Amino acid sequence: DPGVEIGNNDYYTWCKETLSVIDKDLKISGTHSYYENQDRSQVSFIWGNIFLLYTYTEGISLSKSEWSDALMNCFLNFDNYWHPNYKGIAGYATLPTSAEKVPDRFYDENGWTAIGLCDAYLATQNNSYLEKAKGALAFSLSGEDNVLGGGIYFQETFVSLPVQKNTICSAVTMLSCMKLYEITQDRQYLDAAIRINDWTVENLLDKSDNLLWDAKMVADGSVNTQKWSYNAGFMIRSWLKMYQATKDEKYLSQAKATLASSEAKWYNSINGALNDPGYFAFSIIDSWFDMYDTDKNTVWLTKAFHAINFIHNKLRDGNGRYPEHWGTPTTSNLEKYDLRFSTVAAYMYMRAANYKRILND
């Protein structure tokens, strides 16, 4: 029973507490923008804001009236990161930008954002959210070409990084495509997800453990074989959507094989720890929630609540802050922190609150 794991845990309150501390530490006074880190000297990179977007969006499921304004204010902050036309195409930048400036854009960042904006549209029916979801996803899809036979580049403007195509770009683009396919019923999104998936499985999936390698270098086809939880997790979420859309059992079997291997590699089911950066490992928890949505087996929720309980009860420090990595209990207060460390925890708490509500309905 997940009931045993949920107990009297007030996930909804834990989320609000976490958001309060984030705002205190990192909200830029007089704005709805956030600093990157404890130095409070640079506006945040887009990524930590994406976890806020996800949190407020999920909040709508708990209370539309409580979270609608927060979601809209977040969306309007994202407008600061939107570039309406750089070298012929619109898309989000990693830092605030405007039409007359040169942006630094990433195909993965745009897909992470597209996912959130699709969910925001599903929650609210606000067309402006979907317009940007489509624009962000179009930007991600513009990173796809037949160099290496397919796949999507890490970034628009390579400088110090070698030119490469990356699993996370495949995976967030696939999931975005599947969400927009559900909304629009336009088969071109489904076909894109299938094409990108076929390339990704052929080039970046390790058949020995069903985990995902990180990237493939354009210069020589060499693979970065580092295995990160989020490369598996976003592929699992995508495959589960593809299963729902196609009813082809191959997607479910692949999702289950990759998820089992992800649990074996990263999850200590005894204490609930996830042995990776939180801003990656949360994707395994979202995979468990998707599995519950798929088969209604409550054991998936027991795992999710156990891991989220660990975050609160073992990772949270004496100042209500969160560490980068989820693998080990926190034993002293953090001196350094970036926006994404606590925002991902807030998101997890809101997801947990939602599933607690669903179980008690």
Numbering used by the authors: 36 to 396
Text lifted from the article:
Furthermore, we show that despite poor homology at the primary amino-acid level, the tertiary structure of BT2949 appears to be well conserved in other GH76 family members.
Subsequent reprocessing of the data in P22121 allowed facile phasing of the selenium substructure and model building of two complete BT2949 molecules. The final atomic model for each monomer spans a continuous peptide chain comprising residues Pro37–Asn395 (residues 1–22 form a signal peptide and were removed in this construct to allow soluble gene expression).
